[PDB]
Amino acid sequence: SGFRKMAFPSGKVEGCMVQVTCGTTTLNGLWLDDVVYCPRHVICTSEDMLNPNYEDLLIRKSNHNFLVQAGNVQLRVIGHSMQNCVLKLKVDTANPKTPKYKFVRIQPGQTFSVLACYNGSPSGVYQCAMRPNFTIKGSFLNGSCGSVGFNIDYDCVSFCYMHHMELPTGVHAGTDLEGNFYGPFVDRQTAQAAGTDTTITVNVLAWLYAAVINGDRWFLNRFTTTLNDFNLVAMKYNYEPLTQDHVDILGPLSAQTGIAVLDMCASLKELLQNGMNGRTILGSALLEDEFTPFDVVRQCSGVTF
């Protein structure tokens, strides 16, 4: 029993982290087969970041200007190219630790693990979600760019995020591994602000199911609701509208616990309207929305990799 915010084991990704230095700038790269992926802003100065022209800045860079180091050993760069907001540095040696991997672009509401790194060295691992406003709430300091987010399906690492930017509000923005930013953000130091941080309703419901499975039940009530009635309350509280697709995804948790999805929605409705009254659910005093239904099933069943 027990339910914790749990990251995937990070060893398969640790073996892919390298240091990338261009001039005075050092960040992290991801070494898969004979390619190292990193943020293109490695080529920028702090000045350049206000209004960088990356294609022009890249003209002054050659293969030998990209210093790539794996632990204590230097990698030889034999080519480089820009794809959207990432650079692909072709090296002469395939990473011998390359896991089975995929690149995936995730949807808002999906979760993933981040391996925070500095100077190519892993510092820690934690769990995040792609927020509905396409930011993530991470833990990133200067030098952490190029750290990646991922999921694991048995032996295959699906990389979904690379870290690029911190907004003035302290939230984080980045790209998929094809170099396309999530949301409207760009790799320049400019006035770009995050939209409404909507709560991921289907994830809250999954976590309430997790609570029931693990003994926390005080919030269950005698009520039910409808999708349309619940969504009137969801709107008031800046929650994502619940759809029939969400209901269907919660089917397995509903079957396991015997609590109809719409009954759990009525529990959530009362929690939103009345608060917690100083009580806790799975050790939290607020409604947690960074566990997906699949996360809950996984952790409550013991799936391994």
The contact set with its own copies (CB under 8 A) reads 1-12, 14-15, 115-119, 121-126, 128, 137-141, 143-144, 166, 170-172, 214-215, 275-276, 278, 280, 283-286, 299-305
Active site residue 145: yes
Partner that binds at residue 146, options Cl ion, its own copies, none, CB closer than 5 to 8 Å by kind: none
Partner that binds at residue 228, options its own copies, Cl ion, none, CB closer than 5 to 8 Å by kind: none
Query: Which CB atom, from 170 or from 184, has the smaller least distance to its own copies?
Result: 170
Catalytic residue among 145, 160, 164, 246: 145
Query: Which CB atom, from 227 or from 300, has the smaller least distance to its own copies?
Result: 300
Query: Which CB atom, from 22 or from 171, has the smaller least distance to its own copies?
Result: 171
The least distance separating its own copies from the CB of residue 10, rounded to whole angstroms, comes to: 5
Q: In the block, which residue shows the tokens 């240091």?
A: 19
The least distance separating Cl ion from the CB of residue 149, rounded to whole angstroms, comes to: 23
The least distance separating Cl ion from the CB of residue 286, rounded to whole angstroms, comes to: 5
Greatest extent of the chain over all pairs of C-alpha atoms, in Å: 69
The least distance separating its own copies from the CB of residue 211, rounded to whole angstroms, comes to: 11
Partner that binds at residue 171, options Cl ion, its own copies, none, CB closer than 5 to 8 Å by kind: its own copies
160, 182 in Cβ contact below 8 A? no
The least distance separating its own copies from the CB of residue 118, rounded to whole angstroms, comes to: 5
Total Cβ atoms within 10 A of residue 259: 18
Number of residues that bind Cl ion (CB under 5 A): 3
Query: Which CB atom, from 98 or from 284, has the smaller least distance to Cl ion?
Result: 284
Chain positions 271 to 290 lying near Cl ion, rule: CB under 5 A, are: 284-286
Residue 222's closest CA among 260, 259, 263? 263
Residue 81's closest CA among 49, 105, 55? 55
User: What is d(CA 222, CA 258) in angstroms, rounded to the nearest whole number?
Assistant: 14
Q: Going by C-beta distance under 8 Å and a sequence separation of 6 or more, which residues neighbour residue 170? A: none
| Exposure on the CB side of residue 232, measured as CA atoms within 13 A | 6
User: What is d(CA 163, CA 86) in angstroms, rounded to the nearest whole number?
Assistant: 11
* Angle (deg, nearest 10), helices 293-301 and 201-213: 20
Catalytic residue among 22, 38, 41, 80: 41
User: What is d(CA 14, CA 20) in angstroms, rounded to the nearest whole number?
Assistant: 15
Residue 20 tokens, joined: 């990338």
Partner that binds at residue 45, options Cl ion, its own copies, none, CB closer than 5 to 8 Å by kind: none
Query: Which CB atom, from 77 or from 268, has the smaller least distance to its own copies?
Result: 268
Chain positions 121 to 160 lying near Cl ion, rule: CB under 5 A, are: none
Active site residue 41: yes
Partner that binds at residue 1, options its own copies, Cl ion, none, CB closer than 5 to 8 Å by kind: its own copies
Partner that binds at residue 233, options its own copies, Cl ion, none, CB closer than 5 to 8 Å by kind: none
105, 158 in Cβ contact below 8 A? no
User: In angstroms, how far is CA 170 from the centroid of its own chain?
Assistant: 15
Query: Which CB atom, from 12 or from 164, has the smaller least distance to its own copies?
Result: 12
Burial 68-102 (b: 16+ CB within 10 A, else e): bbbeeeebebeebeeeebbbbbebeeebeebbebe
- Continuous segment of H or E residues that includes residue 204: helix 201-213
The least distance separating its own copies from the CB of residue 140, rounded to whole angstroms, comes to: 6
Active site residues: 41, 145
List contacts with Cl ion (CB under 5 A): 284-286
